[PDB]
Amino acid sequence: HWGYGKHNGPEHWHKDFPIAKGERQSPVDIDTHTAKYDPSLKPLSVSYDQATSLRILNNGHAFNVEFDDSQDKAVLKGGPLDGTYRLIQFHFHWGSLDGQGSEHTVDKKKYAAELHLVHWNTKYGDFGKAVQQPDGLAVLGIFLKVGSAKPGLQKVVDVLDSIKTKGKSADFTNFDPRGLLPESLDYWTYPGSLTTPPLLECVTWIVLKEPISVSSEQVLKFRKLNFNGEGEPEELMVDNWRPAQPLKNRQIKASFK
């Protein structure tokens, strides 16, 4: 199926998913000089105090931390958004080396990794209906640079040994995603897509300006995961990022002056 290798990676996805060559694909390079401050934006409201994490899953592409989204427990509102978007999962994309791994870039700079907090618009009732709508999802993207450790990441790191291979999962209750955020909520926003197949053009992207710092040891443990299943030849889960796509007829707006 689709993946990140030479034979099944981003250059191939368009054959099964022709929207890969669409008009609002993600990620993109964020040209900071060209992005424009938008006074009509609002501050982001990130309300995660009642978040209920459930489980962590190696899906063969990344690992997802899943949340109970049966009620408004962890939601994103404000900023460019109309209404309320419920957190369903978060995951990362990362590199084989510290100089690559992010999906979005900032003036062509690649970060070591990128966190995606995925939310769906409650006006559509369920995630599957939301990803049939142009305003169905909001993804909060956060860059990771290597430096000091991120304390709020360490519980994630420590469970990765138990989900090494594709299809493995583990309990992951009582995790607080507030501990993954930087201090500032300043952001860039643009309309885009999922960055994995099916590449659906349903996402309002909200990319924070301030990266979080994680330690070399934390990201090293991401790179010990496997793309393959148990008992199969080991292929390290690294370089699970899609490169920047054409901006086409889009403007990136900034929340900050």
Ligand SMILES: CCOC(=O)[C@@H]1CS/C(=N\S(N)(=O)=O)N1
């Ligand atoms: C429709 C099924 O869900 C997906 O295919 C997932 C949901 S989040 C994502 N890509 S990303 N990296 O843009 O968050 N793909």
Ligand SMILES: [Zn+2]
């Ligand atoms: Zn992602």
